[PDB]
Structure 1
Amino acid sequence: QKHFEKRRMPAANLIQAAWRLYSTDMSRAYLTATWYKLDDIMPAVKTVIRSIRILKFLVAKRKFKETL
């Protein structure tokens, strides 16, 4: 029990990072006139935000694996 409840915070962390990563490309947070314009004039900005979430997903995946 105590060893498999030590997995619960890094498991939650991995799900959250995965979901935040996935939401970069479908969330209502990006379905605004501002983001469509910002994504027209400066496409690199959204890609950078997504690159950062990938890096955080990778870190979170490694930490959850270190609790096995």
Structure 2
Amino acid sequence: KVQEQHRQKHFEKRRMPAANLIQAAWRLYSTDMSRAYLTATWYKLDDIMPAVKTVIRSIRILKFLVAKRKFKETL
């Protein structure tokens, strides 16, 4: 039973990094489709300087890469 109770606790140690990976992946995915960017402000902002949204995407990729590593470090 103790062999059945300590593999839960280590499996619980992956729950948070697994959630962080899913959240960082979705937030990266939503950068190109979310209603948050479907406003007249973001369309004009994306027209006069498309570098702003690309920078925001570059940051989210960097955060997805960190989250993927921390999740793999719990294997």
TM-score (norm 2): 0.90
Structure 2: segments with no counterpart, 5+ residues:
1-7
Partner residue, 1:66? 73
Task: Find the aligned partners of 1:51 and 1:12 in 2 and give their Cα distance.
Answer: 21
Would you say 1:30 and 2:37 are equivalent positions? yes
User: Whose radius of gyration is greater, 1 or 2?
Assistant: 2
Q: Deviations over 1:1-44 (max 9, x none)?
A: 01101000000000000000000000000000000000000000
- Calculate percent identity across the aligned residue pairs: 100
Which structure carries more helix by proportion? 2
Tell me the number of residue pairs that the alignment of Structure 1 and Structure 2 aligns: 68
Runs of 4+ in 1 over 6 A off after TM superposition: none
Higher relative contact order (CA 8 A, sep 6+): 1
